[PDB]
Design a protein around this ligand. Structure first.
Ligand SMILES: *[C@@H]1O[C@H](CO)[C@@H](O[C@@H]2O[C@H](CO)[C@@H](O[C@@H]3O[C@H](CO[C@H]4O[C@H](CO[C@H]5O[C@H](CO)[C@@H](O)[C@H](O)[C@@H]5O)[C@@H](O)[C@H](O[C@H]5O[C@H](CO)[C@@H](O)[C@H](O)[C@@H]5O[C@H]5O[C@H](CO)[C@@H](O)[C@H](O)[C@@H]5O)[C@@H]4O)[C@@H](O)[C@H](O[C@H]4O[C@H](CO)[C@@H](O)[C@H](O)[C@@H]4O[C@H]4O[C@H](CO)[C@@H](O)[C@H](O)[C@@H]4O)[C@@H]3O)[C@H](O)[C@H]2NC(C)=O)[C@H](O)[C@H]1NC(C)=O
Ligand SMILES: CC(=O)N1CCC(c2ccc3ncn(CC(=O)N(C)Cc4ccc(C#N)c(Cl)c4)c(=O)c3c2)CC1
Ligand SMILES: [Ca+2]
Ligand SMILES: [Cl-]
Ligand SMILES: [K+]
Ligand code: NA
Ligand SMILES: [Zn+2]
Length: 806
């Protein structure tokens, strides 16, 4: 209600009731003092000095000032010095390297300004280059990536809050632009008051991190009605505050180009103007900085939240074409789908029937249903009660809706949107931008594409802050920075391995296993012992053994063709490592060995699996981590049938695994000049993306203590310079990895009735993963011994092979 904004315009500390507000959010709350527009939103004479205004007598009613006292007051129009003092616009100056911060007296650290653009698709940097000269200058003189990968869903609020926290949406809680929380019994929407409640927003955003550590920073939010010119003058005025009152971190947000993109499509003729306007805004800021002598002092980040795809009303799939009982569901619609029961706590609603009704029903169906725990692990989109159990991943360019009436509104439905976003974060059109410019960033430097979850750590480094715990890998972006404040180091190994020798006689085992192995000297007898003691180990373990980062009991087991870390707790390897050269031969499993499983005399009966359990369990079969198909000799092949190389596999999954092992590994070795492979099980029954403890396991091989993995991983490494073979590589490494769901059916692959060569590799691609994802899921740390710097290895562990084109 009552009070005035006199002397309080855009105040940094927000005031509580009954008092009214004057901060950059009061409009959104409808709580500004009655004089806020008059005092704080002045517009008279616009935003630019003209020659007749130079030296004018100050008139306090003006939007900005061209009077002689304006620099000292901090409120000149941004082009004042250009029009009134002969100066050049920032964009017209040559790029000059900023070797050290050049800041006015009283500046304790380089401020950080974050310039966020909604819907700014990565390819705008090239395609709109002719109309964005300020942005193209930032980009070419500063540090830039060809693109930056958003988080899933590629929506506005999940991505902006990820930028601010370094957390996946499942952890920070802003899991969509709209969501329903079943505990609150309440819905969050872009428009409305509910989103104002702090209960939705978890983690610790940069502004709170800054404030707790004595670095001044307000929120990054802005009321929509404040025009962009007024946001810029406001940041410039804040920058003129006394040392003790002045923030060190600033955020500008633009609703464009996303606003126009939705109307016109990502490349509509109408899009050129919104890009011109954003560029002009960047020039205002840079001109303003140059006037305050801050242009070689501040670090500027030009970053988007997501891209934009062509999407029209007629490319909509309707759930009413698949379900008969469509009135029993609630759907969060659009470029993703989330389905829950219409009536809360209803007993006769069956997720399984709904999934079945939505699976592979039309040949060219433009969505695929998933239980959230089965979504690709790279999306990290499950561990939150606001994420509905049923999820539809929608094809790029499409929508999903519940019924035709939701889309085609009355009289009779015309469209009027041509662009949208929210799809899978690997989709090219969803990629967005990153540019860093300033003393702390590198000069004229390209960096590879990286994920937006990494930026929070870098922003904290830019500000001298210790980051709160987050999902970035701190050190993975050190290569963006001229001067690093963070020196990453490897985690300490927690469990050391046992190295067992031959300890058990064959007749001590009663595993119900058989093998035809008595088949067949003194020459290849010391050679056998040498191999078991680790002689080929430098060939098959190329980057050191993985470190185990939790308390457990495990054995290193050496063999001619592979090495493994065998867990006595889980009764199977945590990891199995082997190298396949370009020249390696694929062989079959000989007939007499089809069902061969051999006791491992290094490992006690009590810490072994047993064949009887597999015989008894009519759902569950087994496979091998090191593939028998890739044995170096008929004799070495016997090692691949050890009980200690066996893992539980559904027959449906064995189709996938066997194709990977028999066909794909050798293909990758041919294409990449050898590969090193590390494979193993993953257990994540509570879908939190983290290694399960043994008391979290919900499924065992019938009547045994053999736990069933939820997923199987492989990491496939070779030499970046493929003229060098994987095992003799002098330089940087190249990696691709996957985490395959261990599922009892192949319903996810609509083509699975066909030959494996038509569907397996597509499935694997969909489930591509970062090394770092596998680390969280296993409590292992890889690449412990290489000739590469740790920062570079941290970048490699964050890499995701996406299989998109260009
Ligand atoms: C990505 O990175 C993130 C961050 O590093 C990783 O997420 C972290 O994962 C940790 C391990 O799972 C988890 O540890 C929990 O923490 C429990 C305490 O939870 C609350 O407090 C957290 C800390 O708050 C303070 O610090 C932050 C700075 O970061 C400040 O900003 C805060 O203001 C505080 O000062 C807090 O972050 C956490 O937030 C969640 O819940 C909020 C409130 O509802 C949400 O608003 C918010 O969005 C968060 O929601 C996410 O996380 C929760 C789980 O925490 C999840 O359910 C949601 O779906 C969502 O994803 C809370 O407010 C602590 O109690 C836990 O300890 C119990 O379990 C362990 C074993 O698991 C035991 O060792 C322990 O003894 C204890 O068990 C006992 O007690 C239980 C009964 O109470 C019972 O189960 C049992 O029987 C025992 O008796 C454990 O430490 C972190 O909370 C979590 N942080 C975040 C932000 O998510 C994430 O894993 C990374 N992802 C990947 C893939 O790597
Ligand atoms: C958590 C907290 O402090 N709260 C809870 C939310 C609250 C609140 C109050 C008023 C608001 N007025 C406008 N908008 C729209 C807007 O600012 N954007 C579109 C730009 C933007 C900029 C940075 C981030 C980020 N990160 C994000 Cl998600 C969005 C808001 O979202 C908004 C939120 C403030 C206090
Ligand atoms: Ca888990
Ligand atoms: Cl959403
Ligand atoms: K079986
Ligand atoms: Na199928
Ligand atoms: Zn949008």
């Amino acid at each position: 209600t009552s009070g005035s904004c006199k002397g309080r315009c855009f105040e940094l500390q927000e005031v509580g009731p009954p008092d009214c507000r004057c901060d950059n959010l009061c409009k959104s709350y409808s709580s500004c003092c009655h004089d806020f527009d008059e005092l704080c939103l002045k517009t008279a004479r616009g935003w630019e000095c003209t020659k007749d205004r130079c030296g004018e007598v100050r008139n306090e009613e003006n939007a900005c000032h061209c009077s002689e006292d304006c620099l000292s007051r901090g409120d000149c129009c941004t082009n004042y010095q250009v029009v009134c003092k002969g100066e050049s616009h920032w964009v017209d100056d040559d790029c000059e390297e900023i070797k050290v911060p050049e800041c006015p007296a009283g500046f304790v650290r380089p401020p950080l300004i974050i310039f966020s653009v909604d819907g700014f698709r990565a390819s705008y940097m090239k395609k709109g280059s002719k109309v964005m000269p300020n942005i193209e200058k930032l980009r070419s003189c500063g540090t830039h990536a060809p693109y930056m990968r958003p988080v899933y869903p590629t929506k506005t609020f999940p991505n902006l809050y990820t930028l601010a926290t370094g957390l996946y949406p499942e952890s920070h809680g802003i899991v969509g632009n709209s969501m329903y929380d079943p505990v609150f019994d309440a819905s969050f929407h872009l428009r409305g008051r509910e989103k104002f409640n702090h209960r939705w927003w978890g983690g610790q955003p940069l502004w709170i991190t800054a404030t707790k550590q004595g670095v001044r920073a307000g929120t990054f939010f802005w009321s929509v009605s404040i025009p962009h010119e007024r946001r810029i003058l406001t940041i410039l005025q804040w920058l003129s505050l006394p040392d003790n009152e002045r923030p060190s971190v600033y955020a500008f947000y633009s609703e464009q180009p996303d606003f126009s993109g939705h109307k016109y499509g990502p490349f509509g003729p109408e899009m050129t103007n919104p890009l011109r306007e954003i560029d002009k805004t960047v020039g205002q800021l840079m001109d303003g900085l140059k006037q305050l002598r801050l242009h070689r002092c501040v670090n500027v980040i030009f970053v988007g939240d997501h891209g934009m795809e062509d999407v029209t009303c007629d490319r909509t799939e309707f759930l009413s074409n698949y379900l008969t009982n469509v009135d029993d569901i609630t759907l969060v619609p659009g470029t993703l789908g989330r389905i829950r029961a219409k009536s809360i706590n209803n007993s006769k609603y069956d997720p399984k029937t709904i999934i079945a009704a939505l699976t592979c029903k039309k040949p060219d169906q433009h969505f695929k249903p998933y239980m959230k725990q089965h979504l690709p692990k790279r999306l990290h989109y499950a561990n939150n009660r606001r994420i509905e159990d049923i999820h539809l991943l929608v094809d790029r360019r499409w929508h999903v809706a519940r019924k035709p009436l939701d889309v085609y509104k009355k009289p009779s439905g015309k469209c009027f949107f041509q662009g949208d976003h929210g799809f899978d974060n690997k989709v090219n059109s969803m990629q967005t931008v990153f540019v860093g410019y300033g003393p702390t960033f590198k000069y004229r430097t390209k960096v590879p594409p990286f994920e937006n979850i990494e930026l929070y750590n870098v922003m904290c480094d830019l500000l001298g802050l210790k980051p709160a715990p987050n999902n970035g890998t701190h050190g993975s972006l050190n290569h963006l920075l001229r001067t690093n404040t963070f020196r990453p180091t490897m985690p300490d190994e927690v469990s050391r391995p046992n190295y067992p020798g031959i300890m058990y006689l064959q007749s001590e085992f009663d595993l119900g296993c058989t093998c035809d192995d008595k088949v067949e000297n003194k020459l290849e007898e010391l050679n056998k012992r040498l191999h078991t003691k680790g002689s080929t180990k430098e060939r098959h373990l190329l980057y050191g053994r993985p470190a185990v980062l939790y308390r457990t009991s495990y054995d290193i087991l050496y063999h001619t063709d592979f090495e493994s870390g065998y867990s006595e707790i889980f009764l199977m390897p945590l990891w199995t490592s082997y190298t396949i050269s370009k020249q390696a031969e694929v062989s079959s499993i000989p007939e007499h060995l089809t069902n061969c499983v051999r006791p491992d005399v290094r490992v006690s009966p009590g810490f072994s699996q047993n064949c009887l359990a597999y015989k008894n369990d009519k759902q569950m079969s087994y496979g091998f981590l090191f593939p028998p198909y890739l044995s170096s000799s008929p004799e070495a092949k016997y090692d691949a049938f050890l009980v200690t190389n066996m893992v539980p596999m559904y027959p449906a999954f064995k189709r996938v695994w066997a194709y990977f092992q028999r066909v794909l590994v050798k293909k990758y070795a041919s294409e990449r000049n050898g590969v090193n492979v590390i494979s193993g099980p993953i257990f994540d029954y509570n879908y939190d993306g983290l290694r399960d403890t043994e008391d979290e396991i919900k499924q065992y091989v019938e009547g045994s203590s053999i736990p069933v993995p939820t997923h199987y991983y492989s990491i496939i490494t070779s030499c970046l310079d493929f003229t060098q073979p994987a095992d003799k590589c002098d330089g940087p490494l190249s990696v691709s990895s996957f985490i395959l769901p261990h599922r009892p059916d192949n319903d996810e692959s609509c083509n699975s009735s066909e030959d494996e060569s038509k569907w397996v590799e597509e499935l694997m691609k969909m489930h591509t993963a970062r090394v770092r994802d596998i680390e969280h899921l296993t409590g292992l740390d890889f690449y412990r011994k290489t000739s590469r710097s740790y920062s570079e290895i941290l970048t490699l562990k964050t890499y995701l092979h996406t299989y998109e084109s260009e």
